[PDB]
Design a binder for this molecule. Structure first.
Ligand SMILES: CO[C@H]1/C=C/O[C@@]2(C)Oc3c(C)c(O)c4c(O)c(c(/C=N/N5CCN(C)CC5)c(O)c4c3C2=O)NC(=O)/C(C)=C\C=C\[C@H](C)[C@H](O)[C@@H](C)[C@@H](O)[C@@H](C)[C@H](OC(C)=O)[C@@H]1C
Ligand SMILES: CO[C@H]1/C=C/O[C@@]2(C)Oc3c(C)c(O)c4c(O)c(c(/C=N/N5CCN(C)CC5)c(O)c4c3C2=O)NC(=O)/C(C)=C\C=C\[C@H](C)[C@H](O)[C@@H](C)[C@@H](O)[C@@H](C)[C@H](OC(C)=O)[C@@H]1C
Length: 145
């Protein structure tokens, strides 16, 4: 397993997926739903995406739940427009390496397509992460812009 950094992200093949509450068209830039999060003594602002579909399904479900909104989110096929790196939240935490192929970037995502069809996770599965994210939100440690 090879860590993805600003030195080697160009070696990562798409496609990529992003889950969100944002309602945008193909060709639009995602400048919304960046996450302000605490890391190494400061707030950083990143948008998150994956080379696999399922992490974006989680991203859409949690975007909708944290926003208190009804229904399924949106999943976009995306390209980063600047350097990206492993999401440290999902890298050498619960699993070795970055098995969900989840990445973060400081620059907007380009929407290049839409995912229409997916099977969601049961809400019970979403509740434990939502509880944790609600607390981090209250503490200003992870905040959707
Ligand atoms: C694609 O990721 C998803 C599913 C992966 O599928 C799956 C199978 O692969 C996972 C990987 C590779 C992990 O590394 C991981 C993990 O590191 C983690 C929790 C569980 N966290 N919590 C719930 C259990 N509770 C005891 C502790 C808090 C996980 O479940 C997973 C996990 C999975 O379930 N982290 C922790 O336990 C700790 C120490 C802190 C958590 C902090 C916040 C809450 C999270 O970081 C937020 C910012 C998000 O990152 C997640 C919600 C992910 O949603 C997205 C869209 O990113 C989600 C895991
Ligand atoms: C008393 O301890 C606190 C210090 C407060 O004050 C303050 C100013 O000083 C801090 C120090 C000195 C840290 O060293 C620190 C830190 O190392 C860290 C996060 C924040 N972590 N996350 C932010 C969200 N993001 C999506 C995931 C990573 C922090 O906020 C802090 C932090 C503060 O905020 N984390 C990480 O580096 C990594 C790599 C992962 C952590 C994973 C989970 C999420 C955490 O373990 C959860 C379960 C909590 O245990 C902490 C958040 C503590 O919060 C409480 C109330 O217990 C906090 C350390």
């Amino acid at each position: 397993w090879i860590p993805i950094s600003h030195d080697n992200y160009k070696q990562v093949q798409g496609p990529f997926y992003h889950g969100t509450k944002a309602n945008l068209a193909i060709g639009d830039l995602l400048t919304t739903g960046f996450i302000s999060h605490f890391e190494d003594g400061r707030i950083l602002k990143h948008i998150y995406f994956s080379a696999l579909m399922e992490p974006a399904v989680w991203g859409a479900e949690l975007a909708m739940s944290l926003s208190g909104l009804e229904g399924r989110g949106y999943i976009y096929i995306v390209e980063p427009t600047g350097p990206f790196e492993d999401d440290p939240n999902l890298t050498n935490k619960k699993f070795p390496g970055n098995p969900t192929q989840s990445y973060r970037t400081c620059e907007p995502l380009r929407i290049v397509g839409v995912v229409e069809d997916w099977e969601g996770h049961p809400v019970e599965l979403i509740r434990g992460m939502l509880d944790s994210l609600e607390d981090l939100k209250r503490r200003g440690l992870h905040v959707i812009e």
